[PDB]
Short mmCIF file of C-alpha atoms (C1' of nucleotides) in Angstrom, two decimals:
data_model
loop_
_atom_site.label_atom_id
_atom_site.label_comp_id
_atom_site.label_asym_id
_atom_site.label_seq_id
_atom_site.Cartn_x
_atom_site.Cartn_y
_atom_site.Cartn_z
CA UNK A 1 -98.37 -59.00 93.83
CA UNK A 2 -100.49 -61.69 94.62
CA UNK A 3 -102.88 -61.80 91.94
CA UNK A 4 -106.68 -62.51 92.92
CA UNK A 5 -109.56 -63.53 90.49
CA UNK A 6 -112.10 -63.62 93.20
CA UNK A 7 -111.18 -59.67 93.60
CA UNK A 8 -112.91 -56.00 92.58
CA UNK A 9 -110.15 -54.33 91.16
CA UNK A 10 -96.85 -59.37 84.24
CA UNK A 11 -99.10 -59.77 86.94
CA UNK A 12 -101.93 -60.49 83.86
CA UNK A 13 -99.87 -64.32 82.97
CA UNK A 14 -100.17 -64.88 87.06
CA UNK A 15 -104.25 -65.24 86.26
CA UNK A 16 -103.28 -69.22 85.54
CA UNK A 17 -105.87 -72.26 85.70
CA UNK A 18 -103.84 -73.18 87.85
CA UNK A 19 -103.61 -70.24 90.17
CA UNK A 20 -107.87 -70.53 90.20
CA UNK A 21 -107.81 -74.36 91.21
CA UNK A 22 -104.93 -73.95 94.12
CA UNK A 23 -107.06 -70.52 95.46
CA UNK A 24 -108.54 -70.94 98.83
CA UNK A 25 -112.25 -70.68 98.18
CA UNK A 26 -112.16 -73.07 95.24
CA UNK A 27 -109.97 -75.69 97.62
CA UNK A 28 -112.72 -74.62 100.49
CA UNK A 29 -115.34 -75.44 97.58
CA UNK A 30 -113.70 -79.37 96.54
CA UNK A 31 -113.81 -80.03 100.57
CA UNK A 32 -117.36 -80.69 100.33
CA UNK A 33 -118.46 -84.30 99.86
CA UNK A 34 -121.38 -83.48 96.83
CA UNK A 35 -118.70 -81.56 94.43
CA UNK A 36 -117.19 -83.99 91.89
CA UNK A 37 -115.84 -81.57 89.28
CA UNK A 38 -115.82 -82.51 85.74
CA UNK A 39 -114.05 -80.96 82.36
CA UNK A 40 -114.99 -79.10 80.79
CA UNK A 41 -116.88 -77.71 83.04
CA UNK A 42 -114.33 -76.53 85.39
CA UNK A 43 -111.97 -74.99 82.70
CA UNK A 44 -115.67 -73.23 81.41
CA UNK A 45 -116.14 -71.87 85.08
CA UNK A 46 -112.53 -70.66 85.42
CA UNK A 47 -112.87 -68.84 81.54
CA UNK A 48 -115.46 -66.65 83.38
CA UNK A 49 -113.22 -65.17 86.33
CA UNK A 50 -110.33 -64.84 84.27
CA UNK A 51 -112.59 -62.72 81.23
CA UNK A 52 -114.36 -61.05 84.53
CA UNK A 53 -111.08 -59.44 85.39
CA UNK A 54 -109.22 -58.99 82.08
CA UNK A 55 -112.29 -58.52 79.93
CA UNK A 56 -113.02 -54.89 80.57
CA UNK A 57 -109.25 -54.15 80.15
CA UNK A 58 -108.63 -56.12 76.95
CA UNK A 59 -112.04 -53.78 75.60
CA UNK A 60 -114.11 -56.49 74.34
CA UNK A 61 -116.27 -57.61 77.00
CA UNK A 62 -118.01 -60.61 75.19
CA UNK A 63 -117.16 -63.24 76.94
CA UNK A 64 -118.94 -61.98 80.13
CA UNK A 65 -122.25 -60.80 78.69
CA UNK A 66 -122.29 -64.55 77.15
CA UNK A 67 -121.86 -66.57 80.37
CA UNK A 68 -124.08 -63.86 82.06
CA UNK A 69 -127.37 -63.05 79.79
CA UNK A 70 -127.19 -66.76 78.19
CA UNK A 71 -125.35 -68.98 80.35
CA UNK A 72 -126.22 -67.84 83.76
CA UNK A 73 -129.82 -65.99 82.57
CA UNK A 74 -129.29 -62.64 83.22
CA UNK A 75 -127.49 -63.12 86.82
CA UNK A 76 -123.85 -61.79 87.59
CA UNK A 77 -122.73 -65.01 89.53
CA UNK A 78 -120.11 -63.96 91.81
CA UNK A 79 -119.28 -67.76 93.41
CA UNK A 80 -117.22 -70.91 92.61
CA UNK A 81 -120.17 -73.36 93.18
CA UNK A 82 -122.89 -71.47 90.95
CA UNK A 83 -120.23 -70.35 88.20
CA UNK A 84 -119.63 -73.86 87.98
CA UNK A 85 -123.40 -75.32 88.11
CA UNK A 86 -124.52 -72.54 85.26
CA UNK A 87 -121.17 -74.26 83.46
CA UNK A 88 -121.96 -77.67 83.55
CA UNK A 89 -125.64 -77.31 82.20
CA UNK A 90 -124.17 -75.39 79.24
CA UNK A 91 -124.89 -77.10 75.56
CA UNK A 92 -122.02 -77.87 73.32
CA UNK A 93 -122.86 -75.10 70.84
CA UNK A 94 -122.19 -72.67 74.00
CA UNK A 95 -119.08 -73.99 74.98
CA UNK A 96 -118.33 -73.51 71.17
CA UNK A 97 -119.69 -70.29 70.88
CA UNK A 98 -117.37 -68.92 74.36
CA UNK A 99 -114.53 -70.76 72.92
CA UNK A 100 -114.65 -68.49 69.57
CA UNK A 101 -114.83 -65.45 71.93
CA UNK A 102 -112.32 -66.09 73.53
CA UNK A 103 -110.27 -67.10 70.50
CA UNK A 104 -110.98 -63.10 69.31
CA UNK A 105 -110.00 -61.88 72.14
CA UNK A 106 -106.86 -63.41 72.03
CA UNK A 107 -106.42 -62.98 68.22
CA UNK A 108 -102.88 -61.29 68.88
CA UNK A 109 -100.44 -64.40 68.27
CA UNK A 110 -98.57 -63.66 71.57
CA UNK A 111 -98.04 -60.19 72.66
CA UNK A 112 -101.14 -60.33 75.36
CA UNK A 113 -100.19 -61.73 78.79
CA UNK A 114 -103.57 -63.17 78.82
CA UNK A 115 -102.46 -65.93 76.03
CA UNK A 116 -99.53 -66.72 79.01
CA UNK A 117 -102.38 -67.52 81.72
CA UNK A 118 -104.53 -69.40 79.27
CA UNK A 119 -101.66 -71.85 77.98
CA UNK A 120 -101.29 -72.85 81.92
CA UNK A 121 -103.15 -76.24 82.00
CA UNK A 122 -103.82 -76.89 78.42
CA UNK A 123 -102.09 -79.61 76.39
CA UNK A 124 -100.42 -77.23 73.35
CA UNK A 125 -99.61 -77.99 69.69
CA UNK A 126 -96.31 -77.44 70.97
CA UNK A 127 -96.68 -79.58 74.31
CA UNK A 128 -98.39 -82.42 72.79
CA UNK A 129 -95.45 -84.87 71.25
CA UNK A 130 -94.38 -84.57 75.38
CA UNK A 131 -97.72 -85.03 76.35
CA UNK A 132 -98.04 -88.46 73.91
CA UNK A 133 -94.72 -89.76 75.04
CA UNK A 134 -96.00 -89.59 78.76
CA UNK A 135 -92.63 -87.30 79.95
CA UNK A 136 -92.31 -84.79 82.53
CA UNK A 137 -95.47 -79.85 83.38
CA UNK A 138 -98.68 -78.92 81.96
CA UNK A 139 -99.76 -76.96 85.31
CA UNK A 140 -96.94 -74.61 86.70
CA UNK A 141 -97.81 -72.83 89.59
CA UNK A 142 -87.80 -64.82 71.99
CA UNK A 143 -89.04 -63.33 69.11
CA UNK A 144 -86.07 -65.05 67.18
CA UNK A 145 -88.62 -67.17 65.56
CA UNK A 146 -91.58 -64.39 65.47
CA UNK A 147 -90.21 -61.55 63.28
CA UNK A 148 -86.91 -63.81 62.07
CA UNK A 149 -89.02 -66.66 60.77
CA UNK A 150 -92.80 -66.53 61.05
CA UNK A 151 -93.66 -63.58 59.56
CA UNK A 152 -91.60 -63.86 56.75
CA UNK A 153 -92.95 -67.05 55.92
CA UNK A 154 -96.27 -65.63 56.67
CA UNK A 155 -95.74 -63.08 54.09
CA UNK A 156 -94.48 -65.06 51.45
CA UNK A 157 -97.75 -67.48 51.76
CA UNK A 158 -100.33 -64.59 52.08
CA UNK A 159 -98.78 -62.66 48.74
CA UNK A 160 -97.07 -65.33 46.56
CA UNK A 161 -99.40 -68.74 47.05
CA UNK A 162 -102.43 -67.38 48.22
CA UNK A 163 -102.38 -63.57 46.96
CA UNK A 164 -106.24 -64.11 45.54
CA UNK A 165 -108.30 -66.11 48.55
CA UNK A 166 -108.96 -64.16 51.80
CA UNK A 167 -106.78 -65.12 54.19
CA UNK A 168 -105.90 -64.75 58.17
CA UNK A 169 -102.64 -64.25 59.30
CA UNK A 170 -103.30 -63.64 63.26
CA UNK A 171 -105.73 -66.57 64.90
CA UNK A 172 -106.38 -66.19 68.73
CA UNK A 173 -106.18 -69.23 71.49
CA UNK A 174 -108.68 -72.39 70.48
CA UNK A 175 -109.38 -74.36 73.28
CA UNK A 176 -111.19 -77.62 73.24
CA UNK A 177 -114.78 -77.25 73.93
CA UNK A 178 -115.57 -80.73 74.03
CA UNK A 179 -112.98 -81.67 76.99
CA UNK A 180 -110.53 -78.03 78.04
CA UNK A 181 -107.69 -80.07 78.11
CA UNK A 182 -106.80 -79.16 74.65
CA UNK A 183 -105.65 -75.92 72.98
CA UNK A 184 -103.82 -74.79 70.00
CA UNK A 185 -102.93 -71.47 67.84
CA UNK A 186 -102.97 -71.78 64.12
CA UNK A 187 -100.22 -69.91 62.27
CA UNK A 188 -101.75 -69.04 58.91
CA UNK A 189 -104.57 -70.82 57.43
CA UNK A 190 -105.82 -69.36 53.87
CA UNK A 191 -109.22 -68.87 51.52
CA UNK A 192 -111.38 -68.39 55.09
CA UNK A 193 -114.59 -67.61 55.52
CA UNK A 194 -116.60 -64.49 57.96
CA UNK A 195 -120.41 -64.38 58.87
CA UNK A 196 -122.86 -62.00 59.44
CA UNK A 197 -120.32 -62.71 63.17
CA UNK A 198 -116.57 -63.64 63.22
CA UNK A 199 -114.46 -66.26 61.13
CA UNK A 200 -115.48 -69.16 60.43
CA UNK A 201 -113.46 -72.56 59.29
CA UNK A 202 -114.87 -74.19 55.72
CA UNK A 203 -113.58 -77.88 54.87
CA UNK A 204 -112.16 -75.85 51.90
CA UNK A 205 -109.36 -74.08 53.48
CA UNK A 206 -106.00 -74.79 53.75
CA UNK A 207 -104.31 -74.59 57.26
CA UNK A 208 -100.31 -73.80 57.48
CA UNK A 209 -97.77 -74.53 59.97
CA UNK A 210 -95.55 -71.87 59.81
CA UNK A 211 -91.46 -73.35 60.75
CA UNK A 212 -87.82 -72.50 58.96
CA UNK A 213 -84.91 -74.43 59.03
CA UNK A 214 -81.69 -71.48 59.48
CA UNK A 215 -79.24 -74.41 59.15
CA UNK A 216 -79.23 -74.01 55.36
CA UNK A 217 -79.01 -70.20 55.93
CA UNK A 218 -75.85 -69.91 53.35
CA UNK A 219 -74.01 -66.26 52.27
CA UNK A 220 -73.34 -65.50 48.83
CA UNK A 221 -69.60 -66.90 48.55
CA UNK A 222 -67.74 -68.44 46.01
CA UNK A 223 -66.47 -70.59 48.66
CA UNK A 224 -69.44 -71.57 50.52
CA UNK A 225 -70.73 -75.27 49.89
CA UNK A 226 -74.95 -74.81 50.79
CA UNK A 227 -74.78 -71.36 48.09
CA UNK A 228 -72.69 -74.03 45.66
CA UNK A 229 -75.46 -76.13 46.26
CA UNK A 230 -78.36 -73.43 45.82
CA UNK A 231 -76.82 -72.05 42.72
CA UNK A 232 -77.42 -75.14 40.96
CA UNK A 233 -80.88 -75.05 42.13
CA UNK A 234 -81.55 -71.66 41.31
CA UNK A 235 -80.13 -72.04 37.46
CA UNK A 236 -81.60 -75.81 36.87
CA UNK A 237 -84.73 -76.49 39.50
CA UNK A 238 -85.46 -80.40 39.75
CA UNK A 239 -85.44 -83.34 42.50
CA UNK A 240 -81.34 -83.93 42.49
CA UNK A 241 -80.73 -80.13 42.19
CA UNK A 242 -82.16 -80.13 46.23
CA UNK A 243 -80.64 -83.65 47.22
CA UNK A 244 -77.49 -81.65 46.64
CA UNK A 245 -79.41 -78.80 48.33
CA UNK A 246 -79.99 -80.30 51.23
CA UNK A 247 -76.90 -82.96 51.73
CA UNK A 248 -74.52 -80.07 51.38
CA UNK A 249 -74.91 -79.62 55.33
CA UNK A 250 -73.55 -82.26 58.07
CA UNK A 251 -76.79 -82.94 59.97
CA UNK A 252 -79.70 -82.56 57.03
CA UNK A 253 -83.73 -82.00 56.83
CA UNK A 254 -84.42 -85.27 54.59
CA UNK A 255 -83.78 -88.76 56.03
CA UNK A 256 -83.40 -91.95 54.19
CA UNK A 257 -86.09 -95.03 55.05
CA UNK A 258 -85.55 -98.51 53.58
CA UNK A 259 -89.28 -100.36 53.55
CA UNK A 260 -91.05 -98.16 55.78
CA UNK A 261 -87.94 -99.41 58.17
CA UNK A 262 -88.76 -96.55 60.52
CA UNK A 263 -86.77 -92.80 60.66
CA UNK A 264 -85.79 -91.02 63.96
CA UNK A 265 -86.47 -87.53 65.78
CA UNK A 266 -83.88 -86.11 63.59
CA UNK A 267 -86.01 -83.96 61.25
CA UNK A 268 -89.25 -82.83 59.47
CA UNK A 269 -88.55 -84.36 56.38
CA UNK A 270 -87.99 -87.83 55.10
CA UNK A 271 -87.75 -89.64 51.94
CA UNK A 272 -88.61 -93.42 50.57
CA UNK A 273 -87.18 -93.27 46.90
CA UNK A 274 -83.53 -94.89 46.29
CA UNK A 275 -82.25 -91.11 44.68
CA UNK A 276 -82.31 -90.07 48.39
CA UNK A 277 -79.73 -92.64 49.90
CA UNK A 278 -77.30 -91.06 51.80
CA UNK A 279 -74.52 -92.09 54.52
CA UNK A 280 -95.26 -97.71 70.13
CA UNK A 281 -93.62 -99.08 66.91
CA UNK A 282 -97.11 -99.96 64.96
CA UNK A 283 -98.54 -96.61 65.52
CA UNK A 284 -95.67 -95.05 63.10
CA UNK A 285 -95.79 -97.80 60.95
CA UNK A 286 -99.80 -97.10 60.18
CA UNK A 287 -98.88 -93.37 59.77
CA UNK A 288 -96.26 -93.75 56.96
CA UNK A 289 -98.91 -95.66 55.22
CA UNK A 290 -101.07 -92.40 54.83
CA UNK A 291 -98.30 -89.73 54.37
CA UNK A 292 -95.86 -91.72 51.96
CA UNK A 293 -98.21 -90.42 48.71
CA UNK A 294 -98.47 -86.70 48.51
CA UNK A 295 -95.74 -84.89 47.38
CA UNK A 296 -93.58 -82.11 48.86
CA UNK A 297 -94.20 -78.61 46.74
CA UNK A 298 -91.10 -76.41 46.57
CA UNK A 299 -91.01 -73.03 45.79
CA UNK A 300 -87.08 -71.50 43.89
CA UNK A 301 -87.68 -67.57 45.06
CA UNK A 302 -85.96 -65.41 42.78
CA UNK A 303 -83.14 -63.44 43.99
CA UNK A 304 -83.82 -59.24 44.80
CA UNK A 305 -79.89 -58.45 44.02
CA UNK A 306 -80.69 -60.39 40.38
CA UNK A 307 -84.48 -59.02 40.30
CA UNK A 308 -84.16 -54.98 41.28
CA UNK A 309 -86.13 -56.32 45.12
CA UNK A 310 -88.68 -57.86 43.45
CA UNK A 311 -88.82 -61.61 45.27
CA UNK A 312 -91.28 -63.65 43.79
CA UNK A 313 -91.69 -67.58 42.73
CA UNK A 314 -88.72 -67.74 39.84
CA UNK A 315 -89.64 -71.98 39.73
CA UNK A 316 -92.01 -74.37 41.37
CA UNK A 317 -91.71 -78.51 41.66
CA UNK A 318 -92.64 -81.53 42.78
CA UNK A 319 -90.55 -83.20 45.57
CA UNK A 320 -90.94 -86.95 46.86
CA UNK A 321 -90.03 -85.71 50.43
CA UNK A 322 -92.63 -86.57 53.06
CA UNK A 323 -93.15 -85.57 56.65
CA UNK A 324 -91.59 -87.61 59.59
CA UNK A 325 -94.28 -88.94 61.41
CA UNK A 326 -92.06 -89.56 64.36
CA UNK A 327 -91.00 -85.76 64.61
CA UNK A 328 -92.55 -83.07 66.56
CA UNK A 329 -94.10 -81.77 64.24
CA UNK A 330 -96.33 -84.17 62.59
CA UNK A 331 -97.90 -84.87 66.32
CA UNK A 332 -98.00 -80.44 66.74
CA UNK A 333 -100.13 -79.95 63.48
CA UNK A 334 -102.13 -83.42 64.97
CA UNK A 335 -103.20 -81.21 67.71
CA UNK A 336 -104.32 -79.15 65.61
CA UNK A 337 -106.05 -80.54 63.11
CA UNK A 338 -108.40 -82.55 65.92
CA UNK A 339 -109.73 -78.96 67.37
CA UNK A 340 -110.19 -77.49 64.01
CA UNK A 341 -112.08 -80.29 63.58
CA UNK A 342 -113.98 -79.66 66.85
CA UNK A 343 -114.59 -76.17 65.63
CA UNK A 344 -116.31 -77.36 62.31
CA UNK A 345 -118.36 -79.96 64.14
CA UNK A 346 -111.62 -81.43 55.79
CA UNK A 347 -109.14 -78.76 55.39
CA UNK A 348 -106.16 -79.66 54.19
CA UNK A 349 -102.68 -79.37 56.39
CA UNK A 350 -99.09 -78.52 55.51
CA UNK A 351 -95.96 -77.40 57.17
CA UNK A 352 -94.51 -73.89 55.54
CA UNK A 353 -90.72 -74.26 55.67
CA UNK A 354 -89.00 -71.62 54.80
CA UNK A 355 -84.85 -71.46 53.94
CA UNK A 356 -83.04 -68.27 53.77
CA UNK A 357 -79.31 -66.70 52.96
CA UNK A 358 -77.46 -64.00 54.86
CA UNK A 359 -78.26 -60.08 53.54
CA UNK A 360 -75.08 -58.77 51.89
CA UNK A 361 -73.88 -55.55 51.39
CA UNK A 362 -74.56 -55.74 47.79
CA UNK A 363 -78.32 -56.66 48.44
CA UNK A 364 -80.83 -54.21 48.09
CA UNK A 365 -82.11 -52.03 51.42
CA UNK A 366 -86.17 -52.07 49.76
CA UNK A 367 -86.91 -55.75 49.11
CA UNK A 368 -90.76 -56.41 48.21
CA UNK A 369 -92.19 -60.08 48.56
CA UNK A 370 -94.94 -60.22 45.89
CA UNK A 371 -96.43 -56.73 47.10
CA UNK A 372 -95.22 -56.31 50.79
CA UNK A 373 -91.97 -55.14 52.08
CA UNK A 374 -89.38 -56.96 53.80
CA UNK A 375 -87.45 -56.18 56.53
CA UNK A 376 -83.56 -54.68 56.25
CA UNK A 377 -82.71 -56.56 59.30
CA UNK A 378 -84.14 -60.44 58.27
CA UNK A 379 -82.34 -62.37 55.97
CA UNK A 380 -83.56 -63.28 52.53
CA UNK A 381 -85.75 -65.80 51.56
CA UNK A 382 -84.78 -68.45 48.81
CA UNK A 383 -86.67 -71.40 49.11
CA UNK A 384 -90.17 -72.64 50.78
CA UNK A 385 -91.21 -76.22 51.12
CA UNK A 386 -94.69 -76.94 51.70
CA UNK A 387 -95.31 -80.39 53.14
CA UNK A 388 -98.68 -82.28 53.35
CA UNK A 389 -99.64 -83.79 56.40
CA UNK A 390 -102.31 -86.82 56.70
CA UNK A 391 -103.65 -87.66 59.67
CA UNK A 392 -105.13 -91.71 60.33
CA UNK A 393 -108.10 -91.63 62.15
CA UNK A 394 -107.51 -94.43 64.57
CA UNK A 395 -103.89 -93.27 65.12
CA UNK A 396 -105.28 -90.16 65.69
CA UNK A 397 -107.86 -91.27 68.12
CA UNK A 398 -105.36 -94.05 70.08
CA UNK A 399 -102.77 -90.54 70.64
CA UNK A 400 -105.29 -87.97 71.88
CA UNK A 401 -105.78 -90.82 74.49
CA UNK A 402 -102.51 -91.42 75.04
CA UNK A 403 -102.40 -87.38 76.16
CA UNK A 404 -105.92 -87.08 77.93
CA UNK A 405 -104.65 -89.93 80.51
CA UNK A 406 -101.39 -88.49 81.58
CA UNK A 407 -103.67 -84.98 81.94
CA UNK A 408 -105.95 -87.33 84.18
CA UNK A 409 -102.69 -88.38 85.73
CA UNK A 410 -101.31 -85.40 86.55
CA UNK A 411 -104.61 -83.63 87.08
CA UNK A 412 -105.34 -85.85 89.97
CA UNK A 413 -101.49 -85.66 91.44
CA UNK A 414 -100.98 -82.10 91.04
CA UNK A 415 -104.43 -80.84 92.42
CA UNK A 416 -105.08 -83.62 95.13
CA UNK A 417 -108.22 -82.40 97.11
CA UNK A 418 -110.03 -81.86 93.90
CA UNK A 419 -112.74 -85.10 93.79
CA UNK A 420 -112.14 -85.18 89.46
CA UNK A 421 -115.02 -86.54 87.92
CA UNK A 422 -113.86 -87.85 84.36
CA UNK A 423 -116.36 -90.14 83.66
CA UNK A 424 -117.78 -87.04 82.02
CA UNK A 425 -114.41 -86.02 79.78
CA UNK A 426 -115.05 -90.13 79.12
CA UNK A 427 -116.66 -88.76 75.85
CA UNK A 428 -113.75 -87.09 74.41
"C1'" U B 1 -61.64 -73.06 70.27
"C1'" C B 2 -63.92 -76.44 66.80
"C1'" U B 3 -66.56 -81.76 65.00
"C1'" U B 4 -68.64 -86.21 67.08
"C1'" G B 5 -71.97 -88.29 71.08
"C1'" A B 6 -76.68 -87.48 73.72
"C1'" A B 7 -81.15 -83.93 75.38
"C1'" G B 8 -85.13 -80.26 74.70
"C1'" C B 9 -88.62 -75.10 72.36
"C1'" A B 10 -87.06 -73.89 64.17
"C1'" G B 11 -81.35 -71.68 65.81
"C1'" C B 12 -79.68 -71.60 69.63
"C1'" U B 13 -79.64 -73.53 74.42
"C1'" U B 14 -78.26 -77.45 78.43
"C1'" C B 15 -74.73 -81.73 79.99
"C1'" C B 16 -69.90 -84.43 77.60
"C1'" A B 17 -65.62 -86.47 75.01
"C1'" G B 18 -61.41 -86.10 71.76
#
RNA sequence: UCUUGAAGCAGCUUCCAG
């Protein structure tokens, strides 16, 4: 069904940005000679009809009475043209303050079909190494990873590294109030803080990305080379034990750099140090500079069939494995770390990676990570990596440019009739 | 039917060769 947002009344993730800019009385609206739209402004405007419509379903009903007893003074605006007047005299700290409601409102990862509609026209995390590389799109007019990976990970972070700091496992949608070409989803971040009044993000915290290599996903045989590997490990944890770790597969996680000599979109990890030998260019030459210092920490879990279910950190070391600053990645937890930023206006960044074996028949049914169950159907968890990531600021800055002009690009050939002011997304 | 090329959201997936 052909789903309306100028209406008085699946068909939830066909309420796109896109689907409000291509409707007929916003393309009747553009054909006037005074309208120059602007961003955020527009995206701010759209956030109102979409929360209009899905807002009394979803139950909280925030995001309206915002817009309408602050934003638009106690009026119900009903039109395109006075939505987006009311939206482009609104102050930073309410564009802020609608981008947090919204944020709670979506605070279910990604089982609400509003997150679908809401991704439409937004440069993701996930999007954004595409996005930097200018290669085609952002407006279009399974849970393998959720339960397999994520939450497993998840778990292991919230009770076994961060058991004692309040944490928050489920963060909504955080678009960018400063330009609504920008929005991300954080995966776990850890010792948060809540007002009154919502959460809140403190320079203190530590923010995870949440990702698992399976390819090391090994089954407790004799034979097999990655658990000949992970035994060693397991009985004698140090730097070689996981070079032998992690070379005991044909295409591996680490990569080996000479002088900085530049890796490739191979992996997450790479490494500098002679041990590990085994057989825009500027931009990721500045990058290496900042990441090639911290340390990778790596967690040996301790095995349930060995431990009566009990999985829990048996050993914990230091590993001179950094991230690839050419890799997804590095350029997905960028993204991220520039709205959190936003938000605020340092925490500290890593990427969770999590390595696993197959569940035997021998292995117990009632595994417990720290104090939470795991699931009979999930494999079990052996190893975590946590990974630093440092982000340059001028790198940083040159990138999010890099992305906001193919946006302009593609803004201004996708939606044609629309006369895009960007002179005011100029600032950001 | 597998491993070595390449390509994308994590494993798979999408085009090959031998």
């Amino acid at each position: 069904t052909p789903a309306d947002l100028f209406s008085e009344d699946a068909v939830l993730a066909s309420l796109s940005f896109s689907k409000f800019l291509k409707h007929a009385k916003v393309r009747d609206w553009c054909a006037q000679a005074k309208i120059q739209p602007s961003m955020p402004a527009l995206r701010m405007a759209y956030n109102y009809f979409l929360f209009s419509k899905v807002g009394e379903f979803i139950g909280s009903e925030d995001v309206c009475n915002f817009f309408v007893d602050r934003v638009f003074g106690g009026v119900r605006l009903l039109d395109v043209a006075s939505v987006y007047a009311a939206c482009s005299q609104m102050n930073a700290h309410q564009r802020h303050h609608i981008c947090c409601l919204v944020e709670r409102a979506t605070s279910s990862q990604s089982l609400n079909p509003v997150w679908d509609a809401l991704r439409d026209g937004i440069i993701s995390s996930s999007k954004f190494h595409w996005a930097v590389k200018q290669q085609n799109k952002i407006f279009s007019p399974p849970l393998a990873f959720g339960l397999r990976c994520e939450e497993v990970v998840k778990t292991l972070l919230a009770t076994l590294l961060h058991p004692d700091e309040t944490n928050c496992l489920d963060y909504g949608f955080m678009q960018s109030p400063q330009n609504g070409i920008f929005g991300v989803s954080l995966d776990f971040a850890a010792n948060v803080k809540t007002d009154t009044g919502r959460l809140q993000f403190d320079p203190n915290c530590k923010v995870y990305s949440i990702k698992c290599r399976f390819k090391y996903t090994f089954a407790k045989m004799e034979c097999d080379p990655i658990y000949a590997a992970y035994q060693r490990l397991y009985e004698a944890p140090g730097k070689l034990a996981l070079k032998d770790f992690f070379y005991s597969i044909s295409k591996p996680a680490v990569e080996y750099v000479g002088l900085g000599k530049l890796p490739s979109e191979s992996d997450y990890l790479v490494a500098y140090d002679q041990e590990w030998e085994a057989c825009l260019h500027n931009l990721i030459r500045e990058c290496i500079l900042h990441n090639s210092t911290t340390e990778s920490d790596v967690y040996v879990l301790t095995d349930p069939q060995d431990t009566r279910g009990q999985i829990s950190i048996k050993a914990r070391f230091k590993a001179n494995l950094f991230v690839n600053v050419r890799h997804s990645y590095f350029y997905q937890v960028l993204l991220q770390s520039s709205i959190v930023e936003e938000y605020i206006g340092s925490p500290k960044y890593y990427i969770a990676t999590g390595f696993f074996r197959k569940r035997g028949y021998q292995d117990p049914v009632n595994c417990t990570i720290g104090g939470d169950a795991l699931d009979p159907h999930v494999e079990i968890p052996t190893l975590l990596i946590v990974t630093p990531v440092y982000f340059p600021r001028g790198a940083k800055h040159r990138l999010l440019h890099q992305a906001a002009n193919f946006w302009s690009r593609s803004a201004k050939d996708t939606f044609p009739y629309i006369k895009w002011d960007f002179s005011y997304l100029s600032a950001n």
